[PDB]
Structure 1
C-alpha cells in the first residue's frame, strides 16, 4: 500500500508447490495494494552464464577477459546487455525482493545463481568500498522463500543435513547482506513432496498469512552467530 515487491521465481512448472507459493504471494501482496512484479526465470529462458556477451562495448582489456572488471566498466558506461539492465531496473524500484525457489544442492538453482552472478554487478549492487552494511542496495529488504526435499528434522544441528541456517550463509550473508540488503527471516517450506494434500495447503496458507504482516517485520541480525551459534 505504498511499496513495490519483486519476486524472482525459479521453478519450471506453474502447477508446482513453488508455483503455488509464488501465486499466493502475488494474490496477497496485490490484495494489500502493493505493486508486484515477478521475474519468472525459466519462462524468460534467463541466461545464467557470465560471458563476454554481457558487455556490448569496447572492452577495457580485450587481451585478457575479466568478467568482474568488464561488467563494472559496462555498468558505468551503460553498455551491459539489456536482460541484465531490465532486472536491475526491477531491483532498483523494489522495496522488497522475494526469492522463490526449490533448494538445489543446498543452494539456489543455477538459473537463479546466474541471476545473482549477472544482475548484482559492481557499480550497481556493491562497490569498493560500499558493501555489507554499506552496500548499494541499502534500504531494501530481501527474503528467501525456499522449498526442500529434506524434512525439518534432517535440517537440524544433529540431523543429517545440519541446521537449515548453515546453507543460508552464502545467500543471506555472502550475497544479500553483501549488497546492502536487510534480510527478513527465511520462509522454509519443508519436504512438500512427502507431505499430505492438507499439509501442503497448510504451508501455502501459512506463507499467505505471514505476508499479511510482512511490513511489520524486522530483519535478522545477519551475522555468523545467527547462522552458526557460538
Structure 2
C-alpha cells in the first residue's frame, strides 16, 4: 500500500474543492492507500517565511538570508515544528495531490507560502541535483484545479491565453524542480456554471482516475541530461543537443520552446 498527501487550499467545507479532496481521499483509501491531509485553512497554516521559521542560533542575524539559514536549520533540526510536521508528511508520501481554486492565474497565497516555508533547500531541492535528479524523484505530484473562467478562455485563442503557460511555473518551477514526476493536471473549468449532475460526474471521474493514478505516464519535461549543469557552461543546453534540435520544428516544452512551436498541451497531456 502506497502513501498519499492531499494539500487543500480552500477555506469553505461547502466548496467543490473540499468535495474533490473528500472524493480523492475516499477513492485512494478504497484502493488501500494511506491518506494524510494538509487542509491549510483548517490548520490556520502560517504562509509567511521569516526568521521565526528557525528556532536555533542564526549563522548571521545581522544579514539574515532565508535560503542559507533555513537549510542550516533543516540540517541541524531547528526548523519551526509546523514546518517539520509538513516535511514529515512529504517524506512519507509517494503521491502528492494539490487541490485548489485558481486564483490570479496561480496557486492561492496560503499554498504559495506552504511551498516557501516547507520546500527548504537540501530537503526539497539542491542545485547539485536539480529537476529529474531532485529529492522527490521517487514521488509523483498532481494539480487538481478549479477555475471561474471557461475552458475556452484558456484555449490558444482565448482571452486569457494558453493554460499550458499558466501551469508551467508551478509544474516545472516548483514541482519538477524538486524531482517530482508531474502527472496530467485535473482541470475543472467554470465550476460555478457546471450543473449539479455534471458535478457529480466530475467527482466520479476523478475517483476513477485515482484508481490507476500511479501507472499514468507523467508530463514531459526536458531531461537534465540535455544540459551542462555547471556555471562555466551557464547551465545551458549541450552543444550537441542544440545542433540536433536545430532541425526540429517543435521546441521541447513550454519553457524550453527554443523560439519554436510549443508541442500541444505540453503541461496538460503526457505524450
Kept in 2, the 8 Å contact 1:176–1:183? The answer is: yes
Matches of 1:203 and 1:26, distance apart in 2 = 15
Verify: 1:174 aligned to 2:170, yes or no.
no
- Structure 1 unaligned segments of length 5 or more: list them: none
Kept in 2, the 8 Å contact 1:72–1:122? The answer is: yes
1:6: which partner in 2?
A: 5
1:130: which partner in 2?
A: 129
2:111: which partner in 1?
A: 112
Q: TM-score with structure 1 length normalisation? A: 0.96
Kept in 2, the 8 Å contact 1:4–1:34? The answer is: yes
CA displacement 1:80-129 (0-9 Å, x = unmatched): 00111100000001000000000011110000001101100101001131
Per-residue deviation at 1:225? 3.6
2:101: which partner in 1?
A: 102
Per-residue deviation at 1:215? 2.1
Verify: 1:15 aligned to 2:14, yes or no.
yes
SS of corresponding position for 1:219: coil
Matches of 2:136 and 2:142, distance apart in 1 = 14
Q: How does 1:131-170 map to 2 (within 5 A)?
A: 131-170=130-169
Aligned residues: 229
SS of corresponding position for 1:61: coil
Q: Which has the higher contact order (CA 8 A, sep 6+)?
A: 1
Verify: 1:30 aligned to 2:23, yes or no.
no
1:79: which partner in 2?
A: 78
Matches of 1:30 and 1:225, distance apart in 2 = 37
Per-residue deviation at 1:6? 0.2
SS of corresponding position for 1:203: helix
- Structure 2 unaligned segments of length 5 or more: list them: 223-250, 264-271
Matches of 2:252 and 2:104, distance apart in 1 = 23
Larger Cα Rg: Structure 1 or Structure 2? 2
Verify: 1:202 aligned to 2:201, yes or no.
yes
Q: Give runs of ≥4 in structure 1 deviating > 3 Å.
A: 223-228
SS of corresponding position for 1:122: coil
SS of corresponding position for 1:5: strand
Q: How does 1:54-69 map to 2 (within 5 A)?
A: 54-69=53-68
CA displacement 1:147-206 (0-9 Å, x = unmatched): 001111111111011121111111100000100000001000111101111121121111
1:53: which partner in 2?
A: 52
Matches of 1:208 and 1:216, distance apart in 2 = 15
Cα RMSD over matched residues? Answer: 1.2
Matches of 2:155 and 2:253, distance apart in 1 = 14
